[PDB]
Structures are given as C-alpha cells and as structure tokens.
Amino acid sequence: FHVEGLIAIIVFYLLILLVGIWAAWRTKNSGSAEERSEAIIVGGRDIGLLVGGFTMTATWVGGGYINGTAEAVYVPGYGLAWAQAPIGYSLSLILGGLFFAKPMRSKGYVTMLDPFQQIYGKRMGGLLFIPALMGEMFWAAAIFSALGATISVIIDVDMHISVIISALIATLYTLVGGLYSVAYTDVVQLFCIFVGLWISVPFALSHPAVADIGFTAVHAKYQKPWLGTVDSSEVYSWLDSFLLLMLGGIPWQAYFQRVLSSSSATYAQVLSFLAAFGCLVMAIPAILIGAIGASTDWNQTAYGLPDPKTTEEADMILPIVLQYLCPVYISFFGLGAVSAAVMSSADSSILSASSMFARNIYQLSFRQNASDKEIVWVMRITVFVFGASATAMALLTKTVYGLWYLSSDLVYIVIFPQLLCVLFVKGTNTYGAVAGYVSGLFLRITGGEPYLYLQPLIFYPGYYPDDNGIYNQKFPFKTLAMVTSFLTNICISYLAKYLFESGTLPPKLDVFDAV
Ligand SMILES: *[C@@H]1O[C@H](CO)[C@@H](O[C@@H]2O[C@H](CO)[C@@H](O[C@@H]3O[C@H](CO)[C@@H](O)[C@H](O)[C@@H]3O)[C@H](O)[C@H]2NC(C)=O)[C@H](O)[C@H]1NC(C)=O
Ligand SMILES: C[N+]1(C)CCO[C@@](O)(c2ccc(-c3ccc([C@@]4(O)C[N+](C)(C)CCO4)cc3)cc2)C1
C-alpha cells in the first residue's frame, strides 16, 4: 500500500531498461556484415574478464538460490551443513572452468549442442534439445512465481501485475539487445543485489528482540541450533543432492553461452573461476539472513505467535525478514535486490533457451536458405513466445517447483553423460547415446517423482512410505542412474563401433551412419 514503493520500483525498472537499450544501440552494427544470423547468439566473441565474471555470478545467483539457501539454513531438520547450494555452485563452477570450457571455446562454437550435431547428427540434436529447453523454462517459471510471492507480500499490490511487467521488461531486453545488453544489465543487477543484500543485514541484526547468533548457534534455541548435522540414517541422500548440484549445473546454456563469448580460452577459464569466487562471496548474505530469521522470537515481533515455520508459510522467509525486521526504506532495497537477481536469472535463461532453439532447431531442421534475415526474425519471435510461455507457466501452474526439480534431474541424468562422452571419451557413436538417453529417461520416470503422482514404483531399498503416499527412497537413485547411463553409453558405443566390421554384424544395415 506504500505508494512510494511503486515509484521506486518503476524508477529502477525504467533506469535499467534505459541502460540495456543504450548498450544494444552501440553493437547494433557489430561483428561481421553477414553476422546478423549469429551476432545475438555469440556476443561478438569479444567480452572482457570483468563483464563475463559479473554476468555469470548474477546468472547463478538469481534469487531462487538465495531463498533455497535461506530455507536450508532456517528450517528445522535442515541446517547450514544442509545448505549445499552455495558450496555446490562454487565447486561446480570451479570444476567447469578447470576441466570443461577449455575445448568448448578453443574450437569456437555458438550453442552447446554443436559437438552433438557434429558427432551424432541433426537427428540427435533435435531430440537432445528438449531437456535443456524444458529445464530452463521451468527454472524461469519457478523464479517468476517466487518474485510474484515476494511482491504480493512485501507490497499490497497483487502478484499478477508485477510478474507480467517484469516479464515484459525481460522480453524487451532480449528483443532489443542480443547478448551485450544482457551482459551489461547483468553487471548492473549484480551490483544492485550486492549492495541491497549487504545493506539490509545490519539493520535486522541489531533488532532489540532477535537474540544474537553468537549464542543462538550451539546450545538450545526456539527452533533448533541452526548448524544442522547429517543423520547417520541418511548420508547418501546428501551425497546425491551435492552431486546433482555439482554436476547438473555444468551443462547449461547460460554458462556455455558465457564461455562461448570470451576473447580467448584462458580468459574463459579465468571468467569461470571469478564467477565461482563471486558466488562464494554472495553466499554469505543468504546465510546471515537465514541465521537472523532462525534466531528471532517471533511472538514479540509484528508477525505474531504463529511462526512462519508453523504455518506452512516458511517457503518465503527472506521477504518476511525484509519487511518485518527492517524499516520501509531498507525493505525497498532488499526487495529491489531480490527483483534484480530474479531478472538476471530470467533474462539469462530466456536468452539461452531461445538461442538454442532458434539456431539449432530452426536452421538445421526447417530452413537453411534464409541465411541472415529470417534467422534473426526467428530469434526475436522465439524470445517473445518463450516470454509469453513463461508468463503462462508462472501464472497458472500451482506446482512449478516440482517441475523445476524434475527438469533438473532430467538434465543431470541425460545431458551431462552425453556431453562428457562427446567431449572427453571419443569413439562413441549415436547408437549408445540413444540407448543411454532411453535408459536414463526410463530410470528417472519410473523412479517416481516425489512431488507428483505419475508412477512412484520401485523396490528400491529404503523407500519411505510417508503420509501423502509418495513412497520416496533415501538411496541416491539419481547419481547411480546417471552413472549407469554413462557407463552403458560408453560400453555399448565402443562395442558397436568395433562390431560394425566383424561379421554378419552390420555388413548391410546402417540405422544411422557408423562408418
Ligand atoms: C507472547 O507475547 C505477548 C505480548 O504481546 C505476551 O503477552 C503478555 O502476557 C503477560 C502475561 O499475562 C502480560 O502481563 C500481564 O498481563 C495481564 C493480563 O493477563 C495484565 O492485566 C497485566 O497488566 C500484565 O500486562 C503482558 O501484558 C502481555 N503482553 C502485552 C504486550 O500486553 C505473551 O505472554 C507471550 N507468550 C508467552 C507464551 O509468553
Ligand atoms: C528442501 N527443498 C525446499 C525441496 C527440494 O530440495 C531442496 O533442498 C532443493 C532445492 C533446490 C534444488 C535445485 C536443483 C537444481 C537447480 C538447477 O536447475 C539450477 N541451476 C540451473 C541454476 C543450476 C543447478 O540446477 C537449482 C536448485 C534442489 C533441491 C529444496
């Protein structure tokens, strides 16, 4: 109901949009003359270390990660040792920039699936494009729903209007400016989230009511000592989640698009390392906010005796702290920081998915004669369509976090093993890749999603028949699936690639090219 909140938010939006358009105008005429087909997707192959590092740091830290870290820190049963998102992201980026992204940039690509369409073919590229698009779209939709909840609670305005205007801003961004605008707006929002998060903490910390975390950490508190141990019963599950965050974060058109624009491979790996450092340094505010929220005495605050953890409203602790433990003019800063992180992740995801589609699907499946113009038209139209679909998914999907998680498992199981095979383990043909993708899909689908009821059927040891009926299992069931898929891929690919010249084995038939 605060009229000045609308003023501040719209001023922020208009200013940063002006920055994005001012960035796009200069590089309107950039790259080669006939580079209109690929200027958007490639970024001119010339960005600095600073810009790329800031962009990647803003891309991974997109608000949803902040909320997840706060939840893992705050919710009882969880703990700081259960907040594997920051550490997972940091070591994922370090491993990426150290091992991968050297040969991905040294040769010179445009999208992720370039090795896929080079070694398997267009037929496999058009089938492997789906998981990345689905994952990016559901991630963006979940982050949008988070933004809507934050707005609808911090300000009295409804979530629909704010979500739709933010989506309109992102669509204008990825229409007008290809990659330079996204990068410069990423640096703007990264600074914004840094300053907002690190200015909203001390005011809440020194509240007269909340007990100091210097003691509210070890002995006995209202919620729980927020450290959080790993149960001897379940250490596999934590291993599985940690592995998923380490490895499933590597294959992503966001990071791959950022590395595919560095001026040189060395600058690309330094970009990845600096992005990891930035994620590490931006982790701390989320942990501090979680500690602040966990140490409160909610009865004597303005929220009331029913704690958020006791009202099933704990899914959004950070806005509660922002709007209750801090005054109005710092609550606005915190809300702006959250919105900026959301926009960074949203624009990165939309640009990545639309780039992948508009290049790889369109050029290599439908049209190659329209070499320059219709390609840029396809990118802009696809960006707009994906923005509209993001609006629809954010608006009318009650269960979107489950879709986000399911797409994360799908990517981490099907994309990473094939990417690793085509990069480091040569000799694999399309037969083994097809079989491994099929096996991974079967293992994921028949294993049963915890948040819906497609088919939760497995005799997996340690399956837990909880109250809602989702007999989920505590054994990893995800890393074992991915390792089985990768091993099956490599083994049968090698067996076929040798068997094709043995006997009546493939003397005549060739389902796909093998010689
Ligand atoms: C949660 O916080 C509330 C404060 O909003 C606590 O209420 C407080 O309760 C005590 C105990 O009754 C009140 O002290 C005395 O209350 C009587 C009425 O029963 C009154 O006639 C006396 O003059 C004296 O105030 C105290 O006033 C009250 N707080 C306020 C602000 O009025 C509540 O006890 C807390 N929950 C728990 C479990 O302690
Ligand atoms: C306890 N909950 C609330 C329910 C699910 O388990 C959690 O601990 C949780 C939260 C987030 C994730 C998560 C998984 C994948 C991804 C992602 O798609 C995001 N990126 C694409 C940004 C990189 C990593 O892959 C992000 C977050 C996984 C588990 C959070």
Walkthrough of the structure:
The chain has 515 residues and is mainly α. Helices cover 65% and strands 1% of the residues. It has 19 helices and two strands. The chain has helices at residues 3-27, 39-42, 49-60, 64-74, 84-99, 103-107, 114-119, 122-154, 159-176, 180-205, 236-247, 253-259, 265-294, 317-324, 328-365, 373-395, 401-424, 430-447, 479-499; strands spanning 463-465, 471-473. Strands 1-2 form a two-stranded antiparallel sheet. Strand 1 and strand 2 (471-473) form a beta hairpin. Helix 1 (3-27) runs parallel beside helix 9, helix 5 (84-99) runs antiparallel to helix 13 and helix 17 packs antiparallel against helix 18. The longest helix is centred in the C-terminal third of the chain and has 38 residues, at 328-365. Residues 299-300, 305 line the site of a molecule of 3 linked components (NAG-NAG-BMA).
What is the tally of helical segments? 19
Tell me the β content.
under 5%
**Attached small molecules:** a molecule of 3 linked components (NAG-NAG-BMA), ligand HC6
Query: Whole-Å distance between the termini?
Result: 69 Å
Strand and helix order: HHHHHHHHHHHHHHHHHHEEH
Instruction: Compute the CA-based radius of gyration.
Output: 24 Å
In the sheet with the most strands, the strands line up as 1-2
User: How many extended strands?
Assistant: 2
Cytoplasmic side: 26-46, 101-123, 184-189, 257-272, 337-374, 426-433
Transmembrane segments: 5-25, 47-67, 80-100, 124-144, 163-183, 190-210, 236-256, 273-293, 316-336, 375-395, 405-425, 434-454, 480-500
Family: Belongs to the sodium:solute symporter (SSF) (TC 2.A.21) family.
Main location: membrane
